[PDB]
Amino acid sequence: TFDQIRISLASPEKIRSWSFGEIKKPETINYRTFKPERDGLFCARIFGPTKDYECLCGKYKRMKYKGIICEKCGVEVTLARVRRERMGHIELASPVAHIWFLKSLPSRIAMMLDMPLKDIERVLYFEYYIVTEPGLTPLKQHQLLSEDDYMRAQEEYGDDSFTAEIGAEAIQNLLKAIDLEKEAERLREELSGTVSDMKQKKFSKRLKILEAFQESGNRPEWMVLTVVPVIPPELRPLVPLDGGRFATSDLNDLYRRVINRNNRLKRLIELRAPDIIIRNEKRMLQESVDALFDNGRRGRVITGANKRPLKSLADMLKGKQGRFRQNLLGKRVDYSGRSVIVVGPELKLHECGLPKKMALELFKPFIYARLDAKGLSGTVKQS
Amino acid sequence: DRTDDPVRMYLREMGSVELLSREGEIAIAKRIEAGRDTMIRGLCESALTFEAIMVWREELGTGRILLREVIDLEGTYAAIVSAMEGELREGVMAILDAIASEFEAFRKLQDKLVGSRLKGEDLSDADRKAYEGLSATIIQHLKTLKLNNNRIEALVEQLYAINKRLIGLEGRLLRLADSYGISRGEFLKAYFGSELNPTWSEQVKAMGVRWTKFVENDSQSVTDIRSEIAALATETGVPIDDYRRIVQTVQKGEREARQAKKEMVEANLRLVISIAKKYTNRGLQFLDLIQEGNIGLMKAVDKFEYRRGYKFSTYATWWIRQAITRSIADQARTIRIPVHMIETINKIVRTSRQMLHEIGREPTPEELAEKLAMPLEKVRKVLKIAKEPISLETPIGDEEDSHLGDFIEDKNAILPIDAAIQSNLRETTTRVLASLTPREERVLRMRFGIGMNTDHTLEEVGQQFSVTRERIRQIEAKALRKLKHPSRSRKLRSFLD
Amino acid sequence: MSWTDERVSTLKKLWLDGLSASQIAKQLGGVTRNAVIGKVHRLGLSPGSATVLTLGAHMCKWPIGDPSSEGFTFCGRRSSEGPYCVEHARVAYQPQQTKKKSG
Amino acid sequence: SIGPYSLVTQQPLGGKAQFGGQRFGEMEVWALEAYGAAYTLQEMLTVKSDDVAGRTKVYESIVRGDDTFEAGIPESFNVLVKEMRSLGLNVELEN
Amino acid sequence: AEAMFKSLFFDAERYDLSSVGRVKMNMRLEQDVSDEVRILRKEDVLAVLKVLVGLRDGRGEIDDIDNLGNRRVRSVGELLENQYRVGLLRMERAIKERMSSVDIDTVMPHDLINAKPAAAAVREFFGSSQLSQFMDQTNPLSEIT
Amino acid sequence: DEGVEAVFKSVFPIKDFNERAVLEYVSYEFEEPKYDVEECIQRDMTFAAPLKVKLRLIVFETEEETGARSVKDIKEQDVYMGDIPLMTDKGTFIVNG
Amino acid sequence: TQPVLLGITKASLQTKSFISAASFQETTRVLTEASVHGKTDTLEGLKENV
Numbered sequence A: 001t002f003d004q005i006r007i008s009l010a011s012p013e014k015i016r017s018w019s020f021g022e023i024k025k026p027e028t029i030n031y032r033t034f035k036p037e038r039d040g041l042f043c044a045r046i047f048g049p050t051k052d053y054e055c056l057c058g059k060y061k062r063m064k065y066k067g068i069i070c071e072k073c074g075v076e077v078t079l080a081r082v083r084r085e086r087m088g089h090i091e092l093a094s095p096v097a098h099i100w101f102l103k104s105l106p107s108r109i110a111m112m113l114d115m116p117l118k119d120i121e122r123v124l125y126f127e128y129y130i131v132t133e134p135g136l137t138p139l140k141q142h143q144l145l146s147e148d149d150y151m152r153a154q155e156e157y158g159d160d161s162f163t164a165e166i167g168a169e170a171i172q173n174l175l176k177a178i179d180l181e182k183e184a185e186r187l188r189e190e191l192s193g194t195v196s197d198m199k200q201k202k203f204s205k206r207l208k209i210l211e212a213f214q215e216s217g218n219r220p221e222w223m224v225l226t227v228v229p230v231i232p233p234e235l236r237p238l239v240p241l242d243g244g245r246f247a248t249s250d251l252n253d254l255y256r257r258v259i260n261r262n263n264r265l266k267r268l269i270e271l272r273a274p275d276i277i278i279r280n281e282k283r284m285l286q287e288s289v290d291a292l293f294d295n296g297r298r299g300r301v302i303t304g305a306n307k308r309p310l311k312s313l314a315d316m317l318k319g320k321q322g323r324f325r326q327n328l329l330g331k332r333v334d335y336s337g338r339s340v341i342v343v344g345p346e347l348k349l350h351e352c353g354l355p356k357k358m359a360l361e362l363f364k365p366f367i368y369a370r371l372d373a374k375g376l377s378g379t380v381k382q383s
Numbered sequence B: 001d002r003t004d005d006p007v008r009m010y011l012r013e014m015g016s017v018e019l020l021s022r023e024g025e026i027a028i029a030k031r032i033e034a035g036r037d038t039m040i041r042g043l044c045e046s047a048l049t050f051e052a053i054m055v056w057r058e059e060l061g062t063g064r065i066l067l068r069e070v071i072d073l074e075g076t077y078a079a080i081v082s083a084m085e086g087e088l089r090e091g092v093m094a095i096l097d098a099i100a101s102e103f104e105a106f107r108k109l110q111d112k113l114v115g116s117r118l119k120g121e122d123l124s125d126a127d128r129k130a131y132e133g134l135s136a137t138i139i140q141h142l143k144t145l146k147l148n149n150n151r152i153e154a155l156v157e158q159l160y161a162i163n164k165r166l167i168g169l170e171g172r173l174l175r176l177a178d179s180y181g182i183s184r185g186e187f188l189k190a191y192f193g194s195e196l197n198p199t200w201s202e203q204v205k206a207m208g209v210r211w212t213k214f215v216e217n218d219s220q221s222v223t224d225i226r227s228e229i230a231a232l233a234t235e236t237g238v239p240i241d242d243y244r245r246i247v248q249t250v251q252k253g254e255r256e257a258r259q260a261k262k263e264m265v266e267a268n269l270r271l272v273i274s275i276a277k278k279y280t281n282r283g284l285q286f287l288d289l290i291q292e293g294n295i296g297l298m299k300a301v302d303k304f305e306y307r308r309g310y311k312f313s314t315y316a317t318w319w320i321r322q323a324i325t326r327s328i329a330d331q332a333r334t335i336r337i338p339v340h341m342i343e344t345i346n347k348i349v350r351t352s353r354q355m356l357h358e359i360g361r362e363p364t365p366e367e368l369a370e371k372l373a374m375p376l377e378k379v380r381k382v383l384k385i386a387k388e389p390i391s392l393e394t395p396i397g398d399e400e401d402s403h404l405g406d407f408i409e410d411k412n413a414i415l416p417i418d419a420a421i422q423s424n425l426r427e428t429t430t431r432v433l434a435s436l437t438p439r440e441e442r443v444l445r446m447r448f449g450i451g452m453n454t455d456h457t458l459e460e461v462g463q464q465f466s467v468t469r470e471r472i473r474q475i476e477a478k479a480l481r482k483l484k485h486p487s488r489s490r491k492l493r494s495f496l497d
Numbered sequence C: 001m002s003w004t005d006e007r008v009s010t011l012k013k014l015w016l017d018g019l020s021a022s023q024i025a026k027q028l029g030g031v032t033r034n035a036v037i038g039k040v041h042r043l044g045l046s047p048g049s050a051t052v053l054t055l056g057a058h059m060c061k062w063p064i065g066d067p068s069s070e071g072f073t074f075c076g077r078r079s080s081e082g083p084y085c086v087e088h089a090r091v092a093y094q095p096q097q098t099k100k101k102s103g
Numbered sequence D: 001s002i003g004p005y006s007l008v009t010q011q012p013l014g015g016k017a018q019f020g021g022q023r024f025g026e027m028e029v030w031a032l033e034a035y036g037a038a039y040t041l042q043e044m045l046t047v048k049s050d051d052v053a054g055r056t057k058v059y060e061s062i063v064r065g066d067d068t069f070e071a072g073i074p075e076s077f078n079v080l081v082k083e084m085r086s087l088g089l090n091v092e093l094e095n
Numbered sequence E: 001a002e003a004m005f006k007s008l009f010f011d012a013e014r015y016d017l018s019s020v021g022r023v024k025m026n027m028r029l030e031q032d033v034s035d036e037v038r039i040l041r042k043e044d045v046l047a048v049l050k051v052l053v054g055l056r057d058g059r060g061e062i063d064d065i066d067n068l069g070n071r072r073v074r075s076v077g078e079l080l081e082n083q084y085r086v087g088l089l090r091m092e093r094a095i096k097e098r099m100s101s102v103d104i105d106t107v108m109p110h111d112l113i114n115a116k117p118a119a120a121a122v123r124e125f126f127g128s129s130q131l132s133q134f135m136d137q138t139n140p141l142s143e144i145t
Numbered sequence F: 001d002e003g004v005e006a007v008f009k010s011v012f013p014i015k016d017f018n019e020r021a022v023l024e025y026v027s028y029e030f031e032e033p034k035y036d037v038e039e040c041i042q043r044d045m046t047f048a049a050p051l052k053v054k055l056r057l058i059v060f061e062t063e064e065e066t067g068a069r070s071v072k073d074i075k076e077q078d079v080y081m082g083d084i085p086l087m088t089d090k091g092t093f094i095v096n097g
Numbered sequence G: 001t002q003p004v005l006l007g008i009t010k011a012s013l014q015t016k017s018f019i020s021a022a023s024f025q026e027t028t029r030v031l032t033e034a035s036v037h038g039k040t041d042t043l044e045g046l047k048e049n050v
């Protein structure tokens, strides 16, 4: 049983604890033999075996033991149901900002530290440079020098006592350096004894978000996620249709693109490429990350083959496959039938006519039980 | 001013800062060559790279890595494959014979020099008069070697590791000294000027009268720090002898080379956009293709000399096309497809189209084997690849609803009617196993895992039973014959049908 | 060729200490190139006024001469906010920059 | 009565093509909530289409002759929990 | 910026206006120019602005969009022609991009032309399209309606 | 103004300024259908006619601002095109079975 | 303080149980708002038990 369902932010440690293995190669299956890959999205070593009580490579297919692990293959023998309850995590070379807490109607990140939403978008796009930890020199903190001349020509005040960062790392450092108790105490005194003309409309929301982040136990630095978990290989199936032509879900495209961009960024960081190419790679990776979650806030990502827009995780739960009417509330039901209706004057008020064809199919288990108890039949299969 | 376009921002950034240069590529190549020359001149030192690489040169005579591995042959041949590289062996042998004297010289003097540097005594010219000539001869011999890039890269990596250790020690010293309010310039210059003297930490206390409040901790740290650094320098290291300049010259050369390479790759950044535009709608986005082309261009800029093609674009276009084509066939396909497989598919498609256009109505797969000179089983297996699987969200109906995910059956799922039949069979098997004797029932349940999860072979059940191997089969046959009767196996017969 | 107990030992030793796999079969004798690979896979365990050194910030960097020659130096003049000098900035970059496209 | 189930949702397929099941719409659930019926709507949403583990238990009980069923948790809720866990949200059960 | 504004409205391929559009504009506003120019003429904008300024004060009648005179029917001919034109434009782009690699000198035709550069564009029209739907061949009356 | 000839006369010449080569259009011909309707309905084929257009590869532009090209006679080659589905007398547009 | 009135639409916007609000309203604003606050659903309403 379970009660008191609780939802909150997921830390990187919790995501690593949930995951079993890290995926590194965007290889779904082999073209010659259809089997899972070593580090692909469909991996037996990470998401359990494919067959029931049968490991790969034909070594422990006896199905007598379930605690053993194949040495040469590398996957344990377990039922196919375990492949649906196993998740994986993806490592990111650079931090990325969550799309929900950024492009939502109320700017959650903008509510913290009194930052406008227009300025946060510039830092994430690697357009401007934000300054932090200002010394006795000019260019006070939160200056946000726009032109590059201010980052190089205006930076002629010593290589120390002046720190400037750009990208998601800037937002991460700002969220990590921010304090909750001091800001809450400062907003509490300012709220009392104030004209309350326009400052209250923002001070109330800031105090609310601060008190929520305080008692809930979630640090403000969890907004910029570092590792992204992957859905198990059962909600994004790759079942082969009739005729040998497979049919996969649209969720594999987003994960494959994210893995490819992450590998490209990792190869760029090792090769020591220029800052112009490394910046564009980080931008593309962040775009892929925050488009894999919503796909509607930023520019639409459409596949080259199909002319319809891809359905991300957010769009999958809104109106089509969410809990509105598709799976949770309204669902298909067995032991039912449909047919046209007619009028019968001879029937009573509590009696309704039922065709023999529909009644014979709906009451099949009842007929089986009656034949078993009546004694006219023997084995269930025989019945 | 809002854009909401990553590729647009990338093109704006590359267009607002880059330009074009016809003769600029020549200047960039000359700067890269000068940087390589300065790095080579800075890396050829004594007691650090000569003795380090000499341990591998002493392994020569077996022809494993002494010749054709530590020194490039294309460079030595220009200064002058089975039939070639013959005289190069004798050349490297003569070079080793000439450098044997240089290796024997200073080998017994490096230890004396490092010991004199550690002790702190001022070294006179009595040994320097010969050390100068030895260094001149060894540098003259090393200059004519012209080693490959792998050996120099390993040497510079070892030097960078040593410099990282030294800079870590210096950072620890600075973090211990800045608590009092001491700067890095004067402290580093004093450490460099008074490194030989073992009591330099105590002799500086007289000058720094204000340091007396922390002199105790200063000594108790810096004495052990200098002892550790001296041990590290004397174990497998060369004395300093203004080693900071020798380690900074190679760093400056590498920085200049990297800056020139970055300038050259940024000047020709727009060249890849023209090539990437041709490859579109093949499974990869535009930004990914641009990034792959940039990777190819950066990989091609490393090797560019004054060959027949004096234009950098003529040599960069090949690498850009290779990078764009090699990556488009790996990620855009959605499934692991090798390069030879995709190239064979392309060749087969091209030949089939040509034959269908210039022969008849349609080329048959039978003649495609003889036309390409391949077996029928291979050409037949080439087809039916199942490329580009249909998305599960494609709307099957004309409208937006009724997607393809609904018109799909689950084969792995077991119907409840099948599971109900298994319970009946499991129960009827226990009732039928009631007329047989206990011994036959036990042996049958042991050989056949009816109530046991693990199966038992004949020998395994015989080791636990009295009958070792033979009569177990007789007992099983008797039990099977007892169950073959229609009266005892009447209800059990309906399961097989 | 043979596959005795000493054959696998020497093969593993020669694969571990380091040597070309093609010459491994020739040194053992009898065994071919394909056999040794299968064994290792089956068994497992598989002129200016500044040289190239005195070049400071905000100085010309246009090379003059040949780097592999005796005298190779740079201009080394007041050339801030640019790698090359003003006298060579117009000869290096594309003169008369006239380029435009759509966006 | 018993036909092929879905692939990812593990529910009975729809449409008269291959043994479809009459969809219990959202408005139909409000009708049972209007009445005092609480067990008819509880088993009609978990043991008939949602639960895969307890789906065969009710059939075995019916074929044996004893009317009884047990529902632990539907599969749609588990799929939704796995979906929400994929995002940054942490949906953990308590008690 | 000069080329952008010139190609936005004063371009032949970019800004296409059918002859029916020109005749409708001439009927609404007398211009005495039709069937010869397809791009937006510089004098038409001034006439449109003058007519709008006149209608603002009064002495004018608006044009309803639901009127049957302002609606035209696109049969299979025009749709298939537009699809074939898009396919031919794609084929022309492909041929222009491929003609630079192969040496034009000492060459011939039938080789620098894609086999199916536009056949897929015309095959997908009949296959997948909201207009082209299944035939209701249930009786002689449905075949004609 | 309608038909494939419309678009062909719209953009006939595929010219390139780098090499100065153009492709000219002269006319197109329609061939007989390979399969009839009575067999197209049974075989599940596509009722269409193969389209053939005649294009000349010779270009008037040449090097050094000269006049006629080196090849005075035009190529005048026939290139195969994708077939278009024909219309039955009833107007059915039978593309498949 | 005197009570405040609000429409039927916004009546479920600020409800206690986030599961009942995420069903009808947009799942984006309901989940992100309840995620930072960390609201715990008690499964009291009829929509949660269904």
Ligand SMILES: [Zn+2]
Pocket: A055, A056, A057, A058, A059, A060, A070, A071, A072, A073, A074, A075
């Ligand atoms: Zn195995």
Ligand SMILES: [Zn+2]
Pocket: C060, C061, C062, C075, C076, C084, C085, C087, C088
């Ligand atoms: Zn110069």
